[PDB]
Design a protein around this ligand. Structure first.
Ligand code: PRO
Ligand SMILES: [Cl-]
Ligand SMILES: [Cl-]
Length: 221
């Protein structure tokens, strides 16, 4: 048991570091996008920035919304009638953060897919000029986790217990209790009766997220 605990802990730390280092490169691209837009926030300049291959190859789309409701998105897309960027979770979350942020999964207004967004406020010498966001699909996050490793699966859960990414998509945005009503695992401890442990992801901006490692117990050696 000491041996399995030591290994799950070590695997959790590995998986956690790597997803942190997958995310933080993508967080830099958005921050750089926001910084460059703050240079020249004319919508022509904005649109040429978002059309660049480093962004379009990395994200489903990236975009700028501002306090008047103006919205520029690339690749371009017809947004639903009455779409307002200011009421979307990426906008509200970047507004209330002095750093960049990452949203919990939500329903993309463009694709209708489930997505998360990296967003940060774009600031021109103290003044906000809007919020820049980039979108990653839930399926992308599942694939990025399931690529990161021996015995069970990794999933991602917020500190408050909300399951964010899980290879069982039915469990996405269920709380731990709602997903696991009989004997609920607790983040508060780092082992739970499958055996499950939680490893904090360090160094993300604005969020407190955990890697959960879930392994078939008796198969584990
Ligand atoms: O759904 C949203 O709010 C973001 C912005 C447009 C595309 N995805
Ligand atoms: Cl990559
Ligand atoms: Cl446009």
């Amino acid at each position: 048991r000491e041996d399995l605990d030591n290994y799950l802990n070590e695997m959790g730390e590995v998986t956690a570091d790597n997803i942190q280092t997958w995310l933080s490169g993508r967080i830099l691209l958005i921050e750089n996008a926001a910084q460059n837009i703050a240079i020249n926030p004319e919508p022509a300049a904005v649109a040429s920035l978002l059309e660049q291959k480093a962004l379009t190859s990395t994200f489903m789309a990236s975009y700028l919304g501002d306090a008047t409701g103006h919205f520029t998105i690339r690749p371009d897309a017809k947004m639903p009638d009455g779409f307002d960027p200011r009421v979307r979770p990426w906008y509200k979350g970047a507004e209330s953060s002095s750093t960049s942020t990452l949203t919990e999964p939500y329903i993309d207004a463009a694709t209708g897919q489930t997505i998360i967004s990296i967003a940060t406020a774009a600031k021109k010498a103290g003044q906000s000029v809007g919020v820049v966001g980039g979108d990653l699909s839930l399926q992308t996050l599942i694939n990025t986790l399931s690529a990161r490793d021996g015995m069970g699966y990794a999933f991602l859960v917020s500190a408050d217990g909300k399951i964010l990414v899980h290879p069982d998509k039915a469990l996405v945005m269920k709380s731990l209790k709602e997903a696991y009503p009989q004997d609920t695992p607790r983040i508060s401890s780092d082992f739970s009766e499958r055996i499950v442990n939680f490893t904090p992801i360090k160094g993300l901006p604005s969020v407190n997220w955990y890697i959960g490692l879930s392994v078939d117990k008796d198969k584990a050696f």
